């Protein structure tokens, strides 16, 4: 599923994730539009030989099990598959974990390198929350 912004806004915050780990709504909307486009269905392969899966791109290095990336670690203990479904629970559910790791929202390269230090309210700007 491709979601709107405004409508992810508030699925992520019902789901928990608005000011999680100190990190507002806008945080997580800006890493989904960078890392997904707001597409469940995203996958991007790296070069090491792992997978990201989903709206936040979660990694099967270390994350999530596909089957094809030798010593993975299964630390959401899911198969990668659930990433892509038009319920984001799974993905949010991993993401708090991700997040609350020691590098919080800097493991999402996007979110770095597009999102911090920006003006993130942006993204929820106008919606219904
Ligand atoms: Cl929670
Ligand atoms: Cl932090």
Redo the contacts with the bound molecule.
């Keep these: 599923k491709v979601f709107g912004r405004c409508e992810l806004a508030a699925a992520m915050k019902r ?2 994730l608005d000011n ?1 780990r100190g990190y507002s709504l806008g945080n997580w909307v800006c890493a989904a539009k960078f890392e997904s486009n707001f597409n469940t269905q995203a996958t991007n392969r790296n070069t090491d030989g792992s997978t990201d899966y989903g709206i936040l791109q979660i990694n099967s290095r270390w994350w999530c099990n596909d089957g094809r990336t030798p010593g993975s670690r299964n630390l959401c203990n899911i198969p990668c598959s659930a990433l892509l479904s038009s319920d984001i629970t799974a993905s ?2 991993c993401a ?1 974990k991700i997040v609350s790791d020691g590098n919080g929202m800097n493991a999402w390269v996007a979110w770095r390198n597009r999102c911090k230090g920006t003006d993130v309210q942006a993204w929820i700007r106008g919606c219904r929350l």
Aim: aromatic share 16%; charged share 15%; hydrophobic share 15%.
């Design positions: 789901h928990g999680y949010v559910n708090k």
